[PDB]
Design a protein around this nucleic acid. Structure first.
Ligand SMILES: Nc1ncnc2c1ncn2[C@H]1CC[C@@H](COP(=O)(O)OP(=O)(O)OP(=O)(O)O)O1
Ligand SMILES: [Mg+2]
Length: 579
DNA sequence: CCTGACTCA
DNA sequence: ATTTGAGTCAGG
């Protein structure tokens, strides 16, 4: 039905200056993964190429790397990174169907061509899973079966480009795709392929010392409990706490007694064992995830870890980070924070540079809600987190520890994002009456915020979606539900999504501008990680003074708001020391 | 395989 | 009924 040529060799007509291109990587993690087949669809026809052939052809390599030869693809970052592991540079990607689908509706969770094709009732293509199988059954099919699939995906991208571009424009999301998400994709590809170097000697030594400590904590817990049990089993732990030790049951879930951190902290006046158990579970996560888990994914020859930043997953426009996640490395307790000493520069005499947006979503909220007191508070360069802390704990602006400031931060965001008196009371372990009062005195300080939250909920109910500064959209079909719980969740997404998502837009624009600046000044410095409202770089030590100016400036100037943007920054010999 | 732990923004 | 957005892990 769909004619295509199974080429034995690359020909001139395959190298047209506009094409839909498929460079197939079947493994979920595409770092150093096999390329199993290539497809090209253009004005001249439809082609399948064997990668052994095509990727060793100097004209095909040349075409891939030619910025003036425009390619339409699906998940171009996957291809770009797979090709870098093959030592080949991919340039000129002009359209990405994955990112196009993501912006049109992130709720669809589009993650193959067939799923994007369905958005426009295009059915002449199969889902990837149906072709390759799942779990232990996964496999590349016989060549003719593989070739047809790849070509059908290329044909889909080719015929779907205009319809998707048309709808993006209708939505005012065309520049968001072309000028923000697509250029970011290339930047993320660079970051992933660069990787972050790990000090495995230090990490392994930390692991040995941690094992000993876990043993000591473990034995003490058994002593306190009067028996041995699996502390890492919430079920067994529940029996010990609420049956053997007869402690009060504060919460249940569908599976049985809750042993959450929040519940165990509240049980501290009844038995010292709950504090030990909380310590044990913290240490155990360090070991399983940040020592053992991390060392499993280090590439042994280079000692580097290579994350994958998922650009088309979160419902608000944030990135996520997987295998390993490098956006949740410990920082909040000194015990876990020391993990960051194992993340080091990739060359000697280089350093790690880290920058963080100050009170980021509160600034954005001030701008969007146009609240008087809040907009003013940032012109006066106030720290609303610390002020809130002084108030909540009844202390002076010098008795506020970092932990206290962090706890205030969750209260400040909690409130603007819809926390109830019950939630706030449980969060700070205070009376609900007292909690209700903090909330009241909060919306009195910032009345425009309150209006904005009422107003954005009403709007969402009328339009059925909310939007960000750069025209990112989230649909919220549940917001007019007759069901209280379902409706309430959707209403809180309407409160949060425009703010978190606008803040995502900003740091994304900051990454693009920053790279442009790094290139024009021909610095060796380069981005390693993004952590939502943080950018981590490494660079020669001689570039630290110039970065101290360049990085914060670019980040602060990324957009222009009604309030200042403020960036904190540091550097040092390890990620830990960049504080 | 899911749930409830821990980790971050 | 009860802040938002994420990922990985051991246990079961
Ligand atoms: N508990 C929470 N609830 C909702 N959103 C939160 C959150 N914690 C963080 N976020 C969201 C909202 C904030 C944003 C960034 O996290 P930062 O810790 O960096 O908060 P920032 O306000 O920038 O504080 P600063 O840098 O001055 O210490 O992510
Ligand atoms: Mg911040």
């Amino acid at each position: 039905k769909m004619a295509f040529t199974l080429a034995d060799r690359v020909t001139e007509e395959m190298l047209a200056d506009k094409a839909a291109l498929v460079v197939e990587v079947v493994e979920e993690n595409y770092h150093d993964a096999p390329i199993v087949g290539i497809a090209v669809v253009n004005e001249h026809g439809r082609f399948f190429l064997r990668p052994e052939t095509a990727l060793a052809d100097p004209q095909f390599v040349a075409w891939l790397g030619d910025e003036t030869k425009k390619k339409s693809m699906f998940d171009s970052k996957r291809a770009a990174v797979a090709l870098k592991w093959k030592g080949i540079e991919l340039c000129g990607v002009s359209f990405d169907l994955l990112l196009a689908a993501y912006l049109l509706d992130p709720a669809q969770g589009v993650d193959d061509v067939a799923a994007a094709a369905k958005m426009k009732q295009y059915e002449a293509v199969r889902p990837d899973e149906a072709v390759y199988g799942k779990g232990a059954k996964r496999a590349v099919p016989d060549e003719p079966v593989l070739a047809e699939h790849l070509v059908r995906k290329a044909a889909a991208i080719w015929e779907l480009e205009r319809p998707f571009l048309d709808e993006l424009r209708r939505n005012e999301q065309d520049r968001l795709l072309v000028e923000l998400e697509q250029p970011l994709s290339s930047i993320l590809a660079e970051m992933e392929f660069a990787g972050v170097k790990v000090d495995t000697k230090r990490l392994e030594q930390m692991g040995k010392e941690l094992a000993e400590q876990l043993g000591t904590v473990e034995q003490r817990i058994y002593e306190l409990a009067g028996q041995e049990f699996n502390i890492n089993s919430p079920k067994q732990l529940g029996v010990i706490l609420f049956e053997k030790l007869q402690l009060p049951v504060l919460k249940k879930t569908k599976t049985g007694y809750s042993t959450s951190a929040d519940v165990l902290e509240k049980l501290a006046p009844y038995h010292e064992i709950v504090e030990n158990i909380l310590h044990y579970r913290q240490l155990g996560k360090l070991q399983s995830t940040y020592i053992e888990g991390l060392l499993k994914v280090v590439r042994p020859a280079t000692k580097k870890v290579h994350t994958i930043f998922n650009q088309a997953l979160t419902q608000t426009g944030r990135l996520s980070s997987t295998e390993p996640n490098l956006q949740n490395i410990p920082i909040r307790l000194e015990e876990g924070r020391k993990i960051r000493q194992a993340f080091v520069p990739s060359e000697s005499d280089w350093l790690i540079f880290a920058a963080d947006y100050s009170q980021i979503e509160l600034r954005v909220l001030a701008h969007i809600a146009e609240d008087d007191n809040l907009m003013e508070a940032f012109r006066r360069d106030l720290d609303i987190h610390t002020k809130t802390a002084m108030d909540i704990f009844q202390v002076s602006e010098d008795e506020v520890t970092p932990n206290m400031r962090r706890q205030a931060k969750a209260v400040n965001y909690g409130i603007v994002y819809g926390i109830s008196d019950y939630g706030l009371a449980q969060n700070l372990n205070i009376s609900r009456k007292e909690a209700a009062e903090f909330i009241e005195r909060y919306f009195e300080s910032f009345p425009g915020v309150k209006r904005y939250m009422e107003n954005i909920v009403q709007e969402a109910k009328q339009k059925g979606y909310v939007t960000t500064l750069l025209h990112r959209r989230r649909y919220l079909p549940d917001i007019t539900s007759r069901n209280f719980n379902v409706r309430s969740f959707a209403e809180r997404m309407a409160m949060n999504t425009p703010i978190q998502g606008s803040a995502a837009d900003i740091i994304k624009k900051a990454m693009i501008d920053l790279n442009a600046r790094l290139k024009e000044e021909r610095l060796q410095a380069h981005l390693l990680l993004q952590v939502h409202d943080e950018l981590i770089l490494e660079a020669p030590k001689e570039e630290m003074e110039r970065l101290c100016r360049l990085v914060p400036e670019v980040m602060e100037q990324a957009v222009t708001l009604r309030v200042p943007l403020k960036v904190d920054y540091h550097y040092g010999s390890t990620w830990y020391d960049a504080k």
